[PDB]
Amino acid sequence: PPHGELQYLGQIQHILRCGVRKDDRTGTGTLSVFGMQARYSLRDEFPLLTTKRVFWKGVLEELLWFIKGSTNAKELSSKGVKGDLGPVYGFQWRHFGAEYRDMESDYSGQGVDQLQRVIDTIKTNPDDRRIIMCAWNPRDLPLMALPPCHALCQFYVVNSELSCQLYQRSGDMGLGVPFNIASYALLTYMIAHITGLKPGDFIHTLGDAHIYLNHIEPLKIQLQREPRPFPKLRILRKVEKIDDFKAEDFQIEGYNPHPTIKME
Template sequence: KYSGEGLLKNFFGLSVAQQMPSIGLKEREEGDLGPVYGFQWRHFGARYTNMHEDYSGQGFDQLLDVINKIKHNPDDRRIILSAWNPSDLKLMALPPCHMFAQFYVANGELSCQMYQRSADMGLGVPFNIASYALLTCMIAHVCDLVPGDFIHVIGDAHVYRNHVKPLQEQLQNLPKPFPILKINPKKKDIDSFAAADFKLIGYEPHQKIEMKMAV
C-alpha cells in the first residue's frame, strides 16, 4: 500500500489489521503500514499520524537531496537514501528490510549499492532488485546520466520452507536476455512520472511459478 508518491508506491501484501496485532497496531486502518520506506524517503523526521494525512513540506526529502547532490556535487560520498529511522520503528508494521542505498557517479554513469538487512530470496529479492534497478534508471534519467551498476548487499538471506520446491524448479530455468527499459525523454521531474512513461522491450518471462507469502 502507501510507501511514497507517484511510481514510488509499493504493494507489500501485508494487512496490519490481520497480520500485525501482536505489535500493538490493532487500531490502525487496514493497509496503513506506518512511516515505512517512501515516508522516510520523502518526509524523514516528520511526525506520522496516518496514511491519509498530507505531509507536503514536512520532514526532510531525502530523494530530492540525492538528486540535487548527483546534479551539483556528483563526487559527494554521502549520496545516501535511508529507510531506517530508529525513532519510527515502533510505528511501522514491519521494519525496513532494504534499508540503505548509496549512489555513485563515475564516467557519466550512475550506480547504486543497496544494503538489505533481511532478504526473502523467493518473493522479496526479485522485486527488490527490479525496483532499485528501476529507481536507479529513473534518477539517472532525470540527472542526464547513464545507468551503471546495481550492487545488492544482503545481511540475512533466507528461503522459507514453502518456497524450497518452487525455487528448486526455478533454478532449472535458463536465464533469458535482459529486456530494455525505455523512459519518456520528455519527463525530467522525478515526481512527474506515470506508468505510461515506461516501456519494457523484449521482456519474455518463464512460466509463472506459484509461491505464497510467508507471514
C-alpha cells in the same frame, strides 16, 4: 560475456545446502546464509529476471506510490496492486523525521526529503560518497529508540554513469529479491534520467540471505531453467522532476520470461 541472472540462480544454489536452518520473526523455517552481493549491468538492459515471470506491473506501480510519498494503502490498491497504512516507505523517503498524523494530514516541506536530496547531491557534487538514502521497517519504529533502518541504498556517479547499491539487513531470496532487483534498478533509471546520467550498475548486497522452507521445491525447479537475455527499459518521454513520472513513461522490451512461479 557473463549473465547477471546466473548470480541469483547461483546464490539460490548456495543457500540450498550450504544453507543453515534459522527461524524468523514468525518462527517459520528458512535456510540462511550471511553476506551476499551481486552486480547487475543497467547498460542497455534491465535486470528483470527471466527464469520466472516477475510482476513488473507491481514493481512500477509500487515505486510510483513510494515516490509520491503517499502512505495511503488505498492509493496503491486502486492502482491495481496490493486505508491508513502508517508511515511506510514513501513517508520516510520524503518526510524523514516528520511525525505522521494520518494519510490526510499535510507534510509539505516537513521532514528531510531523502529522495530529492539524492537527486540534488548528484547534480551539485557527483563525487560525493554520502549519496545515501535509508528506508525503515515501520514495525520497528515504536519498538525501541533509534532503530536500524531495514535497507539503505547509496548512489554513485562516474563518467556520466549513475550506479546504485542496495543493502538489506535481510532478504527473502524467493519472493523479495527478484522484485527488489527490478524495483531499485528502476529507481536508478529514473534518477539517472532526470540527472542526465546513464544507468551504470546496480549492486544488491544482503546481510541475512534466506530461503523459506516452503519455497525450496519451486526454487529447485527454477534452477533448472535456462536464463534468457534481460529486457530493455525505455523512458519514452522527457521528464524533469521525479514526481512527474507516470506508469506510461516506461516500456519493457524483449521480455521473454519462463512461466510464473507462485510462492507463499
